[PDB]
Amino acid sequence: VVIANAHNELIHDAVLDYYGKRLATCSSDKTIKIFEVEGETHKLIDTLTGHEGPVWRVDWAHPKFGTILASCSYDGKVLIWKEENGRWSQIAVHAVHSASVNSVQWAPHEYGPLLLVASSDGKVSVVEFKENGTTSPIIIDAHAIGVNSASWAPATSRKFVTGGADNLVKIWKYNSDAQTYVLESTLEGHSDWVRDVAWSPTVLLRSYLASVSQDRTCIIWTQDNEQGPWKKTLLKEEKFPDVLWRASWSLSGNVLALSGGDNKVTLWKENLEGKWEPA
């Protein structure tokens, strides 16, 4: 199934929603597009407008809140969108960062309608939408140089991993006696900017993290339990041909989808040894 020419400017993100039927894209044209794919057909449904700069990413929210989509852009702001009564409209706007926002992600539906945001300004913001609408977020300084990604850990006590341009990967946990997310662990292992970080939703004892970097390597970080440390495990002994840009875990099977710069997508799974191989 292919939807050629969804945009005329280069596209940076395409995400299907909770039912994996409703597509959504974003690119330099500074717009988002909603699609409806079936067998091998497709129908545009709208074009979201507002961002003053190329749009970097989008994330669909859990259906239990409505039909929402979040986006962020080089313009250093985040826009939420809604499809009420049959038409999309900018409900809220989040802009507390002073540089390009590169990632945005809806927390687990159990936490409510929270949003995880990371920016080149080095900070990360956590945002909920009050009873009235406005937003009173959490802002933390999380990386030097710039933050490129941030992902939520599955639900139990709330944790999320960030990936900065300081080559570091970082786990965060919420604390009461601070009313903020505090730095739980710093994981060193990349020699160049970390482009993305994905926390696997696998519900097994062991937790899985996958970080991708400008150094042409993918690292799977794992933690057996609370007393265990985060163990480093290169996805493969040899570096890759080009820069790895994204990492995505399936919802089941704990299968990793790696997006390279040689515009190639490799798939991996774990084996008896604890080493990865092509799935």
Numbering used by the authors: 2 to 157, 170 to 292
Question: What does the paper behind this entry write?
Answer:
COPII mediates Endoplasmic Reticulum to Golgi trafficking of thousands of cargoes. ER export is mediated by the coat protein complex II (COPII), which minimally comprises five cytosolic proteins that form two concentric layers on the ER membrane—the inner and outer coat. The inner coat layer consists of the small GTPase Sar1 and the heterodimeric Sec23/24 complex, whilst the outer coat layer comprises the rod-shaped heterotetramer Sec13/31. Here we visualise the complete, membrane-assembled COPII coat by cryo-electron tomography and subtomogram averaging, revealing the full network of interactions within and between coat layers.
The outer coat forms a sparse rhomboidal lattice in which four Sec31 N-terminal β-propeller domains interact to form twofold symmetric X-shaped vertices. The vertex was refined to a resolution of ~12 Å. We could clearly distinguish the β-propeller shapes and unambiguously rigid-body fit the available Sec13/31 crystal structures. Close analysis of the vertex β-propeller interfaces identified a region of density that likely corresponds to a negatively charged loop (residues 339–357: EQETETKQQESETDFWNNV) that is disordered in the crystal structure. It appears that this loop becomes ordered in the assembled vertex and forms an interaction interface with the neighbouring subunits. The proximity of the 339-357 loop to the N-terminus of Sec31 might explain the vertex disruption we observed with Nhis- Sec315, as the tag might displace or interfere with this interaction surface. Indeed, when comparing the soluble cage vertex with that obtained in this study by overlapping one of the Sec31 β-propeller subunits, we find that the relative position of both neighbours is shifted by more than 15 Å. In the context of the membrane-assembled coat, we see a clear gap between both the ‘+’ and ‘−’ pairs of β-propellers. The vertex structure we report here for yeast proteins is much less compact, with deviations of over 15 Å in the relative positions of neighbouring β-propellers.
